[PDB]
Design a protein that fits this description.
Muscle contraction. This is Myosin-11. Muscle myosin is a hexameric protein that consists of 2 heavy chain subunits (MHC), 2 alkali light chain subunits (MLC) and 2 regulatory light chain subunits (MLC-2). The protein is mainly beta and 98 residues long. Helix content is 9%, strand content 29%. The protein is built from 2 helices and 5 strands; from the N terminus they run H-H-E-E-E-E-E. Strands 4-3-2-1-5 form a 5-stranded antiparallel β-sheet, with no helix packed on it. Strand 2 and strand 3 form a beta hairpin. The longest helix is centred in the N-terminal third of the chain and has 5 residues. It starts with 8 loop residues before the first helix and ends in a 22-residue tail after the last strand.
Length: 98
């Protein structure tokens, strides 16, 4: 995006030059990726396995932990595309996790 930064500039502007990769864009196929409540991370990414409407057996794609969790808990994921940007605007999912 812009001129990359010095030691001083690096603290002025965010490192605007973000990047793009096939793996996170191939992984999109797991559209049931949702963010899930956590003490330690705030939130992490898990996936919807069996939709009980208001519950879903969600399963973590970290520990593999099947946690039947509610639709209202499960906070629809935000891909790295908007990472740590210049304004607090550009994040598509304006959400708690993000």
């Amino acid at each position: 995006a812009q001129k990359p930064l010095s030691d001083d500039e690096k603290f002025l502007f965010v490192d605007k030059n973000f990047v793009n990769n096939p793996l996170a864009q191939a992984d999109w196929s797991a559209k049931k990726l949702v963010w899930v409540p956590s003490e330690k991370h705030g939130f992490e990414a898990a996936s919807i396995k069996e939709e009980k409407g208001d519950e879903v057996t969600v399963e973590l794609q970290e520990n593999g932990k099947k946690v039947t969790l509610s639709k209202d808990d499960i906070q629809k994921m935000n891909p790295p595309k908007f990472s740590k940007v210049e304004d607090m605007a550009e994040l598509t999912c304006l959400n708690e996790a993000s």
